[PDB]
UniProtKB/TrEMBL annotation, chains A, B, C, D, E, F, G:
Fe(2+) 2 binds at residues 47-48, 51. Mg(2+) 1 binds at residue 35. GO terms for biological process: intracellular iron ion homeostasis; iron ion transport. This is Bacterioferritin. Fe(3+) 2 binds at residue 53. Gene3D superfamilies: 1.20.1260.10. PROSITE patterns: BACTERIOFERRITIN, FERRITIN_LIKE. The keyword Disulfide bond does not apply. Mg(2+) 4 binds at residue 110. Fe(2+) 3 binds at residues 48, 51. It comes from Brucella abortus (strain 2308). Iron-storage protein, whose ferroxidase center binds Fe(2+), oxidizes it using dioxygen to Fe(3+), and participates in the subsequent Fe(3+) oxide mineral core formation within the central cavity of the BFR protein shell. Heme b 1 binds at residues 46, 53-54.
Length: 160, 160, 160, 160, 160, 160, 160
């Protein structure tokens, strides 16, 4: 009787595909930022990757509970920056994509009466707008102090 | 001058594709095993997933150090079991695949003189034969005590 | 004047040959039981091996004190099981062999007046009947609950 | 599929035979050195015996993992000294024997593609050259200060 | 019998000459960087010097073990920068020199069968590629934020 | 009814006479060894004296329990060395004397059915063979390193 | 093969019958002595009862190990005193009975070659002669200071 709405499972798998992409994008940005010297921003990027990992684990559990089958076989297309600002903007564009898919999804769950899944999307939505606030603030800072000083701020001295 | 052999980067990206697949396969097995009640085996599967995550992070770092570009965009094809034995056998088949790709890869690094990458593959190889010893032992146990008692052993009572 | 009865040294070297065999038999059973998944029984087998190691060290010391020369060059013939019950029965047959050699030996020491060596054999004898009680009990349990449940009981879940 | 190269199992069993011999040789030297009063050298000999025990346990595990059958039934021929220098020289000759068998063995594993076993022999090799450095140094010391002062140095006062 | 291949001792002495040079180059860079105010980079340079000291001590021990005679009498030619970027580039050029000598050397040890010395060079090689990753990253950072901001980042305030 | 076999009391009093002698011999050796400078051997001699004291107390208690009367009025003839080796040999000769009296005595207790006294002699016997092992080892050491180095080893520096 | 000599099991069951009697006799003496006010002697009697309990448990285990069947169905005839001295004398008479049965029994085990059971009787024998020493001493004290002062000594003040 716990069999879920197939449209709801579709939306959760759609969210999962986006999360898996975000996990990989953030992790590669972490390693790239590190190789370039921006170790403080690299660290924040690692943490963001791990937060998306947790979101992906929540979606899988909800999908399997609804007796759907979670798709981990494919990953959404990654946006890979080649300097700091591009990395921040690549991440921002991904969060806005996620925001819109979750906005759509909570409405679909609502209309079909799966209120617990609705609640799951509403929580992912507020998390994303969290990540979005952070990134927009960093990009505004980068813009007002300039890329090279933003880079220096987010870099460690050589003895660390 | 640190520019790496393109054949060596190819092999590391080939390893990365297999690791990312293994990460996803183990994680889904964790959640599936959990939904079926096999919580002790599910836990070991989570740990295995996280170990592969660490291997994938090592390959990315080596690829970026060699000034190659790591591919996280695609994931190797997953093997998804539908009961305990199939889960163990799906994992085993994946480890043997990894063993063979790393065996090939350390020989390619050796011939081309990239001894530090050789060492990286040799370490992944011994880890895989570790995972392989574990799984073959579990499958032998399953075979000698039978699937239902193996399942019970790897399940928790309801108060845990 | 501490020169010992040559017949007494012979008996101690005979005991040493049996102990060295038992040390090797128990250790191989430990590793085998482990490879098959029976990790709790494997652990007890390791401890038994180490106890025999200690017995072998006691015999060597007594032999050298009596100015005899301990023979470590050859090992008595090993009994190697191919499943749990055979492992337990191979060990039992070895302990009964040891019991009989020590029974004979304490009588030889007694008749020849080497009472301290007599005491050494009497202590090995009571230890062996200890090991014998343990094994007979395990085999009775195996018989009453059946090999597959005895195997499961002596196996660990996969997360350990 | 984990079935190992029979030539590789042969070499591991060959190593095991040498290790078991070394375990017994070092242990008997420990007890002998003790009976003669050279308690500090006796202690080091006990530790060496126990290190070889650990090497023997590693070989057994690798053999059983490769689905070979480890031979513990026979022990390689022991070299037994009758004074300090002979004990040190008997041990040295044994380590050089082991060095050469492991040198041969890592090359055989390499040619046949069993790189994890290669790594195992390379680790035993560096350990042996460790034991060899120690013994050559002790023998040089014995030579420069003379056997009786070397004996005194490696003996304890009577209250210990 | 521990007499080593003369070609192997030559290569270890060649490595020693390079290490001693690196020890002196890093130490002088430490003091120079300090005099110029770049105290955080100076500290990392001191640590690097001390790591090379440890490498030099490992080579000496291996040389004396192989009954060769280590040459400490001469030091390889030093590269001495006159500002931050030149200091980093002088160090990088030295590490690439070391990388190539160790690459050559492990192959010579391999061909001649001195596998433990091979392992020693392979460990120095991976350490050097470590130092090389660090320096290339610092130089990329210097390039993207500019020398004066890189200098400021690696300088301490006057109260420290 | 606890009245003991008069032959058994005789043997215990015979043992007591030997123990009291040994107590006095060891104690005088302690003080003598001390006056000569051999303070480490002197200490061991004090401990040996005190162990014999404990043996003498055990015999007295057993004698009084058997309602015999323990003879402390006379002491067996003492062996008093005039240098280190003579002290060790005087002690050894005394232990062999004790060994033989206890060997005889446990047989007399056995034949007459006083098994608890038998056990008492068997315990004194194993203690004596303990003391005998120690002394024979010390004398062998003295022989192989020479009296003057054995003396030095068992002497303390002047600040202790 | 662990089947025991039927004569040996008979003797152990004979010992068990005596121990069970002693357990009950000591316990009733404890309660009686308590009711009469002799609380310090009552306490010692409780401890003695519990020691016999432990002896009885040892005999049962040995009987079941020898695949005999322990008889707990009947208890040997109890000796119940009506004042302090009679209580002490009733206990003494019981210990002498036990002494003689164990003396007989160790000889029977010896002749039939069951040396581990021999050792068990020898240990019970020395324990009994322990209990016998204690009681004879208490009765001698009672005799020399008189029953009423012995009673007072073994009584507590009313506030305890
Ligand atoms: C389905 C995809 C993934 C899932 C479900 C997932 C899940 C998780 C979770 C729940 C943790 C928390 C472990 C802990 O700290 O207790 C974790 C940690 C981690 N993740 Fe992932 N993750 C995924 C993808 C990735 C990828 C692609 C990488 C690439 C390197 C990665 C790297 C790591 C690392 C290094 C850790 C740290 C583990 C440790 O500290 O021992 N993860 N992951
Ligand atoms: C003459 C034969 C042997 C003797 C005299 C002997 C003696 C001993 C002793 C006294 C110990 C106790 C060390 C301690 O825990 O403090 C020990 C430990 C051990 N034994 Fe043996 N043993 C023998 C045979 C073997 C064999 C054939 C193996 C095969 C692997 C083995 C494996 C071990 C191991 C792994 C340890 C643990 C050492 C540690 O924990 O560091 N032994 N042995
Ligand atoms: C210009 C030449 C040298 C300078 C300026 C120098 C300086 C120093 C200093 C200040 C330390 C103290 C580090 C500490 O313990 O906190 C040190 C440690 C050390 N030195 Fe040197 N040294 C020189 C040459 C050498 C050489 C040729 C070797 C050859 C092996 C060497 C081996 C070591 C080692 C092994 C340490 C220990 C570092 C540690 O404990 O981590 N040094 N050195
Ligand atoms: Fe966050
Ligand atoms: Fe997310
Ligand atoms: Fe997000
Ligand atoms: Fe693992
Ligand atoms: Fe992996
Ligand atoms: Fe793996
Ligand atoms: Fe045991
Ligand atoms: Fe034994
Ligand atoms: Fe045993
Ligand atoms: Fe060692
Ligand atoms: Fe070894
Ligand atoms: Fe060795
Ligand atoms: Fe470093
Ligand atoms: Fe270096
Ligand atoms: Fe370096
Ligand atoms: Fe002692
Ligand atoms: Fe004594
Ligand atoms: Fe004594
Ligand atoms: Fe008591
Ligand atoms: Fe009793
Ligand atoms: Fe009693």
């Amino acid at each position: 009787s716990m069999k879920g709405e197939p449209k709801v499972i579709e939306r959760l798998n759609e969210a999962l595909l986006l999360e898996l992409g975000a996990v990989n994008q953030y992790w590669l940005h972490y390693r790239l930022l590190n190789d370039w010297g921006y170790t403080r921003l690299a660290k924040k990027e690692r943490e963001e990757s791990i937060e998306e990992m947790h979101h992906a684990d929540k979606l899988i559990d909800r999908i399997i509970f609804l007796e759907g089958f979670p798709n981990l076989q494919t990953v959404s297309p990654l946006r890979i920056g080649q300097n700091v600002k591009e990395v921040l903007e690549a991440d921002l564009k991904g969060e806005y994509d996620a925001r819109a898919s979750y906005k759509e999804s909570r409405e679909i769950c609502d209309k079909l009466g799966d209120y617990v899944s609705k609640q799951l999307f509403d929580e992912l939505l507020a998390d994303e707008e969290g990540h979005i606030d952070f990134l927009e603030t960093q990009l505004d800072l980068l813009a007002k102090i300039g890329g090279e000083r933003y880079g220096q701020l987010n870099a460690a001295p050589a003895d660390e």
